[PDB]
């Protein structure tokens, strides 16, 4: 997960009012660009590439109808019940597969940085960060369980094989610390870091590249 920065709210959301208007009344052609310009086509919880995506609510409308037409609750996750399937990752598994979960026990990528709650390993599995005690550790565990980050094979295997595809590069970068100057090595690391944004999984590669 990434720290997502919000922008100006689209005006089409303020046109309708929660309760009187249903979610199906809006057109998604206006919220998708707004989600994309801040997410870049990556999964609000899984860094899944948005080939089959849908608008996701952090708080489901069944038990929180008042949080319907608010851009804070809006997120772009993978999967689509409209296109059918058995999706078990990001938003779809949050709403259906997990069940019986508390909203405040899930980290929000909007205001809360997921870096200090989640750690991504070389093996490809995500674990809570070292030193998490009390509500932080439980919150990270609940996030992992609800979003099925450690779970369905199509995510664990894909992330693992994406991280293991760059490990020779990481070894070759870090093994020549004495050969390169501090400034040259730092700028080369910056060049490597700035262009993994085009890659699929942001933080797993970032965790495999950064300190």
């Amino acid at each position: 997960m990434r720290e997502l920065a919000r922008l100006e709210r689209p005006e089409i959301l303020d046109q309708y009012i929660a309760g009187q208007n249903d979610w199906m009344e809006i057109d998604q052609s206006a919220v998708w660009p707004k989600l994309t310009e801040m997410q870049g086509g990556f999964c609000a919880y899984c860094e899944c590439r948005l080939n089959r995506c849908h608008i996701e609510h952090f708080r489901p409308r069944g038990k929180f109808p008042a949080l319907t037409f608010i851009w804070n609750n809006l997120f772009g996750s993978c999967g689509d019940s409209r296109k059918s399937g058995g999706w078990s990752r990001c938003g779809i598994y949050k709403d259906n597969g997990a069940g019986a979960y508390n909203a405040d026990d899930l980290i929000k990528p909007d205001e809360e940085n997921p870096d200090d709650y989640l750690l991504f390993l070389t093996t490809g599995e995500v674990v809570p960060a070292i030193g998490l005690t009390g509500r932080a550790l439980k919150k990270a565990q609940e996030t992992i369980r609800v979003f099925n980050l450690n779970g369905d094979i199509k995510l664990f295997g894909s992330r693992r094989t994406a991280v293991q595809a760059i490990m020779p590069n990481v070894e070759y970068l870090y093994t020549l610390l004495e050969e390169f100057d501090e400034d040259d090595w730092n700028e080369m690391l910056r060049d490597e870091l700035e262009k993994i944004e085009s890659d699929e999984y942001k933080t797993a590669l970032k965790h495999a590249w950064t300190f």
């Binding site: 058995g86 750690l119 390993l121 094979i153 894909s158």
Partner: protein
């Protein structure tokens, strides 16, 4: 009426042309000659038209294949639809998902075509009223709808098999008339003038049965053409029938003077290539065979020309198919000395008889031999009979096959039989690695039978890694989860990242366990030591940066 049927038939419709032909033939001989008519020629051209493509394979003008299959309240499916491919369709899923059920339904549908080809208005197989209907159900009946394609003149042949459960007042009927009509066209045209007939075969789990040629099997003269439709959809190919037919072919080939003088002449003109070099001991009982060739001159002069036996061509075609598809088998023939008739093959350079084959080389050979026999017998007007059209159902194609064999079974089958529509189920990523993504129909792992209209996977399986196919398509870990040694690398990751990325007592103990278990040259230890090297110097660089950052 005649005018409407003529308008439709001149446009390319086959049913209208056959109707016109029948109404002309059953009338007075002024317009009915049973043939040499415009409509009969139209029908036979529609069936027989084709062209050799750029690769040398005969491609019929009007291909025959199954388009859609609908399963309503059939076994575990409340309502399911499939979009069978024109050339190859692969059905994958866990155990108890319905792949065998789909193949069983397709075979039951094809049984009506087979029966009405063999026998006018014949009765095919029917759905079981005891097991086939869904246990839960809502109406206590099941439907199996199929649509077939036979060219632009016959774009749809809808056939539906229906059955009601035991103790139900209202019984549902089957709509099998269009299949009867198409098979009537095939049978009538074939009897008037020989045509190439389609092949319908089912190879289910009932194959791989032990032994071969159990009984003399007085069953109807394997030599005759319509013996290729006998037990063709039973699940287990009649390999005893193939062996009897092969011995029949060998007897016909070696019992013809014209078909024996050719080998006598060649055999005589082989010792000259050998006895001239030396070996004066290979002529005493071998130049005597030259006298046999001389005797063949007086045993002949009745054929003079031709002398090309059809049975010999069939035998050669079947032998070539068997040797090309089966990897281990290099040759196959029949021995008459030791005067029980027995068939011998050559496995890995060793001449072995048919009964000492293993399970995996005998089962695959049985399938290939039965299919080749049926293709040869049903396609007498083709230069390569294996290029005929038909539908073949194979269940668990990787049965008893080593992973080396699974890498080439699909390619060999598609090369030997290019016009056959193969519908296949499998549990293997190795076979899927040789199959295009578009040809795979997968079952969702969390499915209870309410899913409809199966879909192809997302990841391109053809040419992909087997481990990747296991990860993304088979929904299975590449590393077992129930083994404690599998999580050792992740545990090392945790115990290494805990302090600063450096080793300590428990991390060193875990590293020693990994080294002792997996070994020195194992990739697990290589990953562990690369991880250690990366983390130690990452920590060093972090300390270096933090020194100047204060």
């Amino acid at each position: 009426m005649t005018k409407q049927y003529e308008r439709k038939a001149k446009g390319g419709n086959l049913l209208s042309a056959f109707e016109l032909y029948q109404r002309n033939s059953d009338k007075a001989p002024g317009l009915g000659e049973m043939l040499v008519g415009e409509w009969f020629e139209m029908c036979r051209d529609y069936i027989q038209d084709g062209h050799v493509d750029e690769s040398g394979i005969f491609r019929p003008d009007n291909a025959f294949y199954l388009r859609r299959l609908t399963l309503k309240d059939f076994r575990r499916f409340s309502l399911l639809e499939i979009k069978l491919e024109e050339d190859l369709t692969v059905i994958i899923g866990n155990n108890g998902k319905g792949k065998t059920s789909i193949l069983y339904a397709i075979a039951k549908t094809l049984s009506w075509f087979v029966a009405n080809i063999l026998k006018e208005g014949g009765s095919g197989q029917r759905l079981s009223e005891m097991t086939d209907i869904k246990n839960d159900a809502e109406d206590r009946y099941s439907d199996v709808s199929s649509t077939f394609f036979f060219g632009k003149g016959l774009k749809s042949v809808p056939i539906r098999l229906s059955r009601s459960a035991l103790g139900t007042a209202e019984r549902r009927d089957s709509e099998v008339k269009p299949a009867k009509d198409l098979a009537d066209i095939w049978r009538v045209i074939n009897e008037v003038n020989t045509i190439n007939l389609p092949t319908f075969a089912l190879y289910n789990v009932e194959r791989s049965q032990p032994f071969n040629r159990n009984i003399k099997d007085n069953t109807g003269r394997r030599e005759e053409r319509f013996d290729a439709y006998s037990q063709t959809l039973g699940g287990a190919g009649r390999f005893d029938h193939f062996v009897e037919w092969y011995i029949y072919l060998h007897k016909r080939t070696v019992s013809d003077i014209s078909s024996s003088i050719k080998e006598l002449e060649q055999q005589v003109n082989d010792l000259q290539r050998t006895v001239d070099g030396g070996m004066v001991s290979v002529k005493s009982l071998l130049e005597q065979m030259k006298f046999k060739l001389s005797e063949a001159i007086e045993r002949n002069d009745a054929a003079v020309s031709s002398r090309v036996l059809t049975e010999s061509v069939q035998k050669s075609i079947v032998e070539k198919a068997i040797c090309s598809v089966v990897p281990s088998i290099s040759n196959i023939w029949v021995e008459m000395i030791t005067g029980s008739d027995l068939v011998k093959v050559t496995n890995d350079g060793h001449d072995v008889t048919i009964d000492q084959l293993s399970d995996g080389q005998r089962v695959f050979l049985s399938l290939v031999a039965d299919l080749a026999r049926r293709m040869v017998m049903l396609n007498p007007l083709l230069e390569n009979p294996l290029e005929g059209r038909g539908i073949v159902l194979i269940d668990e194609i990787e049965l008893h096959l080593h992973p080396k064999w699974q890498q080439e079974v699909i390619l060999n089958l598609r090369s030997a039989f290019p016009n056959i529509q193969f519908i296949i189920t499998t549990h293997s990523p190795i076979v899927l690695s040789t199959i295009e993504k578009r040809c795979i129909r997968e079952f969702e792992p969390n499915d209870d039978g309410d899913q409809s209209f199966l879909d192809s996977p997302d990841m391109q399986t053809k040419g992909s890694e087997n481990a990747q196919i296991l990860e993304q398509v088979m929904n299975v870990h590449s590393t077992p989860p129930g083994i404690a040694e599998s999580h050792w690398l992740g545990n090392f990751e945790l115990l290494l990242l805990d302090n600063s990325g450096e080793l300590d007592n428990h991390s060193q103990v875990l590293y020693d366990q990994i080294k002792a278990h997996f070994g020195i040259d194992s990739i697990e230890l290589k990953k562990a030591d690369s991880l250690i090297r990366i983390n130690k110097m990452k920590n060093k660089l972090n300390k270096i940066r933090a020194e100047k950052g204060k």
